[PDB]
Write a protein that binds this ligand. Structure first.
Ligand SMILES: Nc1nc2c(ncn2[C@@H]2O[C@H](COP(=O)(O)OP(=O)(O)O)[C@@H](O)[C@H]2O)c(=O)[nH]1
Ligand SMILES: Nc1nc2c(ncn2[C@@H]2O[C@H](COP(=O)(O)OP(=O)(O)O)[C@@H](O)[C@H]2O)c(=O)[nH]1
Ligand SMILES: [Cl-]
Ligand SMILES: [Cl-]
Ligand SMILES: [Mg+2]
Ligand SMILES: [Mg+2]
Lengths: 394, 394
């Protein structure tokens, strides 16, 4: 019997999940995308993949895009064709749920009309409202066209009347969708049934978070281990509350050493100390089994490190979890523990005993505070600069 | 340490879940509603409850309405006041997530406008579109009013312009919402944090399905047992595919003995044989641990029983799971096994060894086919006409 592993980030993104997933695919026979869309990409060896799991570059791996993914058919076909150019037999090992909702031009438009008071949101809205076109509809061209015209009679009304923005042309959408069914046909399937047959065959399955139960049709007690990818410090891209934010020379050093810059904008990310209050909530929500702590090497050379172990709100109440309401972060302050840093390099160290004593004590304290083990550790950007203390597929 | 149990029906509703949940609450210190709304009710002793869990009638139980529930504030307050009339101290033991989306008059209207080409759907639509008013907004009356007027500027446009139906009056909605904050205030909280503190205290928690992970903020590996409430035959209320449907005197007998009539309409439900193809998919999707088979007594006196173990599609392909697409049920037929019935009464039998041999063989075969145990069995409508072979909280 195999093991079923979910991998997700525990903070506010940018936790270094890509190379950890790539490493874990050496042990998986099956990799599953079950949530999200094509918002964030992953760069690897040959090419950026946003919908196709990176397990595709292992010859034995079957990759699944499960029903919880909303997909733009043209974004998917471009990724496919790109990998086909590099000589990957994609269509033999990529499988796509017939129940994926499509992201179409009008979803993107409603996104744009609303931003000025990538379609993923409006697509999920159509799905919840029981009106979304799906992959399976491509195979009934009569129904696809009927439902598309009828959906466009509404979304175009909303776009031009309410938002005073341009409509989406029905005829050009039918024209662009002409080849989608034939392009996707050999890959479409009942993904959940496939996953349960793999489970029956004892194969290892990796669920790659961009929930599993609804998004892949895969019940919760079959999940054997949840790996929480957790950077050794915290970053944030957007505005809003950041209790451990560093606005000084230490934060600037972290940003530089960790290359914490927007991949498209070049804008530096906000940086701050490790925040265990944030992590406690992530562990509870996701029943995280163990952590993969990443970018330890970025902290080399700091004289002291801090860990936020509580928050103190405006009244001086001590909080062990982040407040639900963003109002409560006003006049809210972190409560820190202080640990000594290390001067020795941890870059690309691959055995725990080669780490400096203060680095191991930092990691041990995170384990003590959070109550779950650090089962993996990344000490560099290279896939193999990774210590596996306990394998998630054990 | 306690156990965390999810209870759900495995078929198309009407599986007899109410009295099983009531029985299980004797072992739970905490009962959680995490999905759905006030669509279906449960009748019990003193009164129909649609939002408040029936654990409220046990003095030690804390009841939670978690963030995944969309709630009409006036429907909730009426249930509360009703139970208060029967002298239940509701407000001390009922807890409500600040993050529940509200169901408001305009949601119901959009329901009505769409049916003619109870608001639960449009409320979830608002939530997905990141625009839903929530319980927590009642406590910022300035923001509640600002967001309500702005939301109504849209939903009223859609109602009158698109659907040519009446608008919803903003001022009367503000008037009706005037007392909601003060009414709900002592009960509102961070439900997920509460559930994890109960979990830490080792208390038994019952999740009552009307998912758990998102709807209650409660990670999948903390779920210890999923109980699948499973009627000994199948019923359906709506139209559409029903492969084991019985259109004869046997189905009519089942309908009568099982009182299979719409609680409001009086219309008889469609009845049919036990369908293990349906059940296999339910078990996979929900990782069901064990079954509670209900209404065994309804089958007393039948000469033969059938169980659908596969489907045969139009081409004669043999299917082990129901097809995803409703098209594929056209010219689709069940594949049956036949078992002998029993003449002896099973009504209110409470020890397995008092059951007739053919009844135990029927149940054993369902276990063999489905590969999970029958851990509970209901033989009558009374809460205690129930055999517990293995307790879910074990
Ligand atoms: N210094 C350092 N960089 C890392 C580490 N892990 C990942 N990175 C880098 O951090 C960035 C984000 O990691 P990843 O999610 O794997 O890449 P992405 O999927 O392309 O965003 C990439 O530029 C990685 O090379 C690590 O432990 N140390
Ligand atoms: N004959 C019979 N009736 C049952 C059994 N279990 C439940 N019922 C009845 O079936 C109906 C549905 O059960 P339940 O879900 O507990 O009640 P509800 O929540 O009020 O819909 C009710 O009228 C119950 O009394 C059983 O094993 N045998
Ligand atoms: Cl699927
Ligand atoms: Cl909550
Ligand atoms: Mg990353
Ligand atoms: Mg019922």
């Amino acid at each position: 019997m195999g093991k079923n592993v979910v991998v997700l980030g525990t903070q506010w993104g940018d936790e270094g999940k890509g190379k950890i997933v790539d490493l874990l695919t050496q042990d998986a026979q099956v990799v599953v995308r079950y949530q999200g869309g094509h918002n964030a990409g992953h760069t690897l060896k040959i090419t950026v993949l946003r919908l196709i799991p990176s397990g595709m570059l292992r010859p034995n791996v079957t990759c699944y895009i499960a029903n919880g993914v909303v997909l733009s058919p043209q974004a998917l076909l471009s990724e496919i064709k790109e990998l086909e150019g590099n000589g990957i037999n994609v269509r033999e090992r990529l499988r796509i749920s017939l129940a994926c909702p499509l992201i179409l031009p009008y979803h993107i438009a409603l996104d744009k009309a609303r931003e000025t008071h990538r379609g993923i949101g409006p697509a999920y809205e159509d799905k919840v409202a029981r009106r979304a076109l799906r992959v399976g509809d491509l195979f009934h061209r009569d129904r696809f066209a009927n439902k598309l015209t009828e959906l466009l009679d509404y979304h175009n009304f909303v776009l031009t009347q309410y938002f005073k923005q341009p409509a989406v042309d029905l005829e050009s959408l039918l024209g662009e969708s002409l080849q989608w069914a034939e392009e996707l046909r050999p890959m479409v399937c009942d993904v959940s049934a496939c996953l349960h047959e793999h489970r029956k065959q004892g194969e290892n399955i990796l669920f790659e978070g961009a929930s599993v139960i609804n998004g892949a049709g895969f019940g919760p007690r079959y999940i054997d281990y949840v790996l929480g990818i957790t950077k050794a410090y915290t970053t944030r891209v957007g505005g809003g509350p950041f209790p451990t934010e560093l606005l000084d020379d230490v934060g600037k050093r972290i940003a530089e050493r960790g290359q914490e810059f927007g991949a498209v904008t070049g804008r530096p990310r906000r940086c701050g100390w490790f925040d265990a209050v944030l992590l406690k909530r992530s562990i509870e929500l996701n029943s995280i089994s163990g952590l993969c702590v990443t970018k330890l090497d970025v902290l080399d050379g700091l004289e002291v490190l801090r860990i936020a172990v509580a928050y103190k709100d405006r009244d001086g109440n001590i909080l062990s979890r982040p407040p639900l309401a963003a109002d409560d972060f006003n006049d809210l302050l972190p409560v820190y523990e202080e640990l000594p840093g290390w001067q020795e390099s941890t870059a690309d160290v691959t055995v725990m005993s080669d780490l400096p004593a203060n680095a191991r004590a930092y990691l041990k304290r995170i384990e003590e505070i959070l109550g779950i083990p650090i089962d993996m550790l990344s000490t560099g950007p290279e896939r193999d600069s990774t210590i596996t203390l306990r394998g998630p597929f054990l």
